[PDB]
């Protein structure tokens, strides 16, 4: 609350990743690390995990406390992309494939 920093610990998927009814994807994550409250590191990269694509819809997502749960809405581009949550080796890398309805 006083100092806003990026979470350094591990996240885990806490619900099936799924499509909304308005062309977006929702991901729920449990924060298992420390230093909370802290900001959830998250971005979407291309099929090569290189360039940043799509965008995050939710306002700056936070992990409020240890073992807290956070809902995140984002907008992957069409085709293959990777939702990367957290930093370092423990980072979650989730393959998403978006088709045209």
């Amino acid at each position: 609350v006083e100092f806003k920093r990026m979470c350094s610990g591990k996240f885990s998927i806490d619900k099936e990743m799924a499509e909304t009814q308005h062309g977006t994807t929702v991901v729920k994550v449990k924060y298992e690390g420390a230093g909370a409250p802290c900001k959830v590191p998250i971005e979407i990269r291309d099929v090569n995990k290189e360039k940043v694509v799509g965008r995050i819809i939710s306002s700056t997502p936070f992990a409020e406390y240890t073992n807290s749960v956070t809902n995140i809405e984002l907008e992957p581009p069409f085709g293959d992309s990777y939702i990367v949550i957290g930093v370092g080796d423990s980072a979650l890398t989730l393959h998403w494939f978006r088709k045209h309805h």
Epitope: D14, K30, F97
Partner: antibody, heavy 121, light 108 residues
Framework: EVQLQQSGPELVKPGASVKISCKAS????????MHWVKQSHGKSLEWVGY????????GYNQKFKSKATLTLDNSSRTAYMELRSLTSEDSAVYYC??????????????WGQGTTLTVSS | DIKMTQSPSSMYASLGERVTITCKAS??????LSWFQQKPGKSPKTLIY???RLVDGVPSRFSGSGSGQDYSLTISSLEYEDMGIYYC?????????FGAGTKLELKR
Amino acid sequence: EVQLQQSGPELVKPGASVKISCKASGYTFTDYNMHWVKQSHGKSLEWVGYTYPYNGGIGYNQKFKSKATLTLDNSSRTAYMELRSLTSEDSAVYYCVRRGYRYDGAHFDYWGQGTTLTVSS
Amino acid sequence: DIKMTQSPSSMYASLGERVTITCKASQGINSDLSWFQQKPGKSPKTLIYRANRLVDGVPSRFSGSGSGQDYSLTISSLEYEDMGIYYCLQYDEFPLTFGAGTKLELKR
């Protein structure tokens, strides 16, 4: 029509392992996750885990993390659940059940016929 | 883990009557809730998902309602084939958890 066909009954000794299959048909396989569920005789249903068709999206109920290994084969539209270090407590009926993660998907609407596992010496 | 509590554990009814059974989550599950019916030695058959979406092919006498922590399944007019055990499932958060079931039996 949607169909989930599981492999037949299994009878093994304690310490052994088994691998139950669940072949799907009648829908776009990659648009659905496959969950596995345990039901001991006379007991409630219990979540084992699930598999998501892309990049080994794997979820384990922490209870089964040292017991089960879930896998997928998208090309054959077949899900597998492998149980190891078996004991009598593993004896139960196991089901596969699908869950659509797309905007137009249905949730847990079709189950497999179930697969009976009996562990004993 | 989210605890799912079904009430009642068992109950009796007569053909033609409305039956309502309930399922309460220990925390809000945002309508990520499904209902199933299961007969002895058979696999579960799904009635409802997303708390109120009727599964294609399932008779219209079954309906689902509720929100937050509380959910109800209602059979408007009980029929003979409706006997069995009904289960609820939350899939809002891992691990998925099931209620202990409600056994529905026939009066006489």
